[PDB]
Amino acid sequence: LKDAQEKLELAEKKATDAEADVASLNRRIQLVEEELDRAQERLATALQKLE
């Protein structure tokens, strides 16, 4: 159907936009993982200085 055709096209476009946000969330995940590792290391050094 023509309207179902437009709807499916719009939904697939919405899927692709969700995939663009999937990319952005992947970038957030990776950078925050770097942050997690850096925090582990910095906390270790801070506790050592405490000792």
Binding site: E33, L36, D37, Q40, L43
Partner: protein
């Protein structure tokens, strides 16, 4: 004079012994426990159950 001095010395000697040697009974309590880290390894659960 020596007798009076030694009286006070001996009197304080036992007090010092009790105050100090008894510290050696335990001094490890300063040592803290593990306080381990996770390193993004303890992320193995979903939002299925929360009450328990």
């Amino acid at each position: 004079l020596g007798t009076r001095a030694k009286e006070s010395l001996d009197l304080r000697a036992h007090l010092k012994q009790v105050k100090k040697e008894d510290i050696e009974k335990e001094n490890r309590e300063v040592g803290d426990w593990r306080k381990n880290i996770d390193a993004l390894s303890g992320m193995e659960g979903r939002k299925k159950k929360f009450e328990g």
